[PDB]
């Protein structure tokens, strides 16, 4: 964190609850997508989706 970067968004005030809650909602979405993508990529070839791609009946 850089002082001037923080000041451009909040000046010398702490972050208010309203903004904290709003940020938590955004965090939840972005964080989940990022983790899931990294996790599925790390296990590529082992997932059912990957197996179903080749295997069939």
């Amino acid at each position: 964190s850089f002082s001037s970067l923080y000041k451009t968004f909040f000046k010398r005030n702490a972050v208010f609850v309203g903004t904290i809650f709003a940020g938590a909602f955004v965090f939840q979405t972005v964080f989940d997508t990022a983790i899931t993508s990294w996790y599925e990529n790390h296990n590529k070839g082992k997932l059912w989706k990957d197996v179903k791609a080749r295997i069939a009946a």
């Binding site: 010398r12 005030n13 702490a14 208010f16 609850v17 309203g18």
Partner: protein
């Protein structure tokens, strides 16, 4: 009728008062305790007392004159009072003390006797004057390691180490024509004074400029002088305020007037239009309090001082007061601002339109030294009446809201909570 200001080498300033029955002539130097160091701290106070020494006072009394001297943070004064006719006799004494004499007042017996006198003086102040001792410590912690932190009376340690040479060094460095203003108040004309001054000659260290140093800085901090043997808790608390000649000088003074002063034992004081009074009288949180807006050349302090015997509820006293301060930023009303205007005008009028020439001398000299002139009540009142609720909120959001504080206290202060609990009260939770 508008305060004259003339310069021929020596800057002379007067304020004629026709209703005055006396006259005050003296010299004000633009150097005070803020121009000393931790080791010669008290040198100015020592000078004040040798000037008020018996030998010097007896000489003045024979002439029907009275001596006055005040040691401040930014300035220092030496005034002589007399009848309007004996105004020239004042100048002779003044001239004598700061041009002719030197080794007379700085003699071994006079200096030592005076030194011993101020030593017992300062010892009594530090030992018994709790509200002022606390206010002095507020300045000390708020501006620590900075010029403004030094007490005006000096410290015992530095005082007992002071010698005649220290006095001389300070005099040679600060008692200069370029750092002075000769004042004239009460019943006297400018021409009468300027011609009487212009009558003599010489210069005594001409062109010599005073010493320079580093600027004052505010530091969020605290000094706690707990003493459980004292009957009360004395506390002073403040944020960085306004320096003299600040654009918010009056807005700050008005803000302080909103919360004002209070004396629980005075019936009318309990009836003031101050919202904080509704919170603190139920369980009688304090004996008295007074808000202030102290202004100096480099900085200032805005806050309050209070004394209380309610040692178990100090936390409520502080909490309610700071919660009220919070209001200046978000909800101060129009009537609170209007009440403050009227009372501020009265305060200034009582300060500047006092019936005392020595007071006028000190104020006149101090102001002309800082801004070259003295502001009139007419202009001051106009500025005050122009202050709006938005101006107060803008100033408070800058100086009060979520800002660092300086705290000082003595006595039974066990109940005064930690710094952070007090500091957190400088704001309120918001959605």
């Amino acid at each position: 009728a508008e305060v004259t200001q003339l310069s021929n080498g020596i800057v002379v300033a007067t304020e004629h008062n026709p209703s005055a029955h006396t006259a005050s002539v003296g010299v004000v130097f633009g150097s005070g305790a803020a121009n000393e160091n931790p080791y010669n701290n008290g040198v100015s106070n020592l000078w004040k007392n040798i000037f008020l020494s018996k030998e010097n006072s007896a000489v003045a009394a024979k002439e029907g004159l009275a001596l006055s001297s005040n040691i401040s943070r930014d300035f220092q004064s030496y005034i002589v009072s007399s009848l309007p006719g004996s105004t020239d006799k004042s100048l002779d004494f003044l001239n004598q003390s700061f041009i002719q004499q030197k080794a007379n007042l700085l003699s071994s017996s006079n200096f030592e006797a005076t030194k011993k006198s101020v030593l017992k003086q300062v010892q009594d102040f530090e030992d018994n004057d709790h509200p002022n001792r606390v206010l002095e410590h507020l300045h000390s912690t708020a501006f620590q390691n900075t010029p403004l932190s030094l007490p005006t009376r000096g410290t015992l340690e530095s005082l007992e180490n002071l010698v005649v040479a220290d006095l001389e060094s300070f005099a040679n460095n600060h008692f200069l024509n370029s750092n002075a203003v000769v004042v004239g108040t009460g019943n006297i004309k400018h021409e009468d004074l300027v011609n009487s001054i212009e009558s003599k000659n010489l210069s005594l260290q001409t062109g010599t400029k005073p010493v320079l140093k580093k600027k004052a800085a505010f530091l969020g901090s605290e000094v706690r002088l707990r003493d459980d043997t004292l009957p009360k808790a004395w506390i002073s608390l403040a944020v960085e305020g306004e320096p003299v000649n600040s654009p918010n000088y009056f807005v700050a003074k008005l803000a302080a007037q909103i919360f004002g002063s209070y004396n629980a034992f005075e019936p009318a004081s309990r009836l003031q239009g101050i919202k904080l009074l509704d919170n603190i009288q139920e369980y009688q949180l304090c004996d008295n309090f007074n808000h202030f807006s102290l202004s100096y050349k480099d900085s200032g302090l805005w806050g309050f001082s209070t004394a209380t015997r309610n040692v178990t509820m100090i936390d409520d006293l502080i909490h309610f007061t700071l919660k009220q301060w919070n209001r200046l930023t978000i909800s101060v009303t129009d009537t609170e601002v209007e009440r403050a205007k009227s009372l501020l005008k009265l305060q200034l009028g009582q300060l500047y339109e006092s019936g005392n020439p020595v007071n006028d001398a000190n104020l006149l000299g101090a102001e002309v030294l800082i801004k070259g002139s003295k502001l009139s009540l007419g202009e001051a009142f106009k500025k005050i009446d122009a202050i709006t609720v938005k101006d107060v909120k803008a100033w408070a959001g800058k100086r009060l809201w979520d800002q660092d504080i300086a705290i000082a206290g003595t006595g039974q202060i066990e109940g005064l909570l930690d710094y952070m609990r007090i500091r957190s009260d400088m704001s309120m939770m918001r959605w």
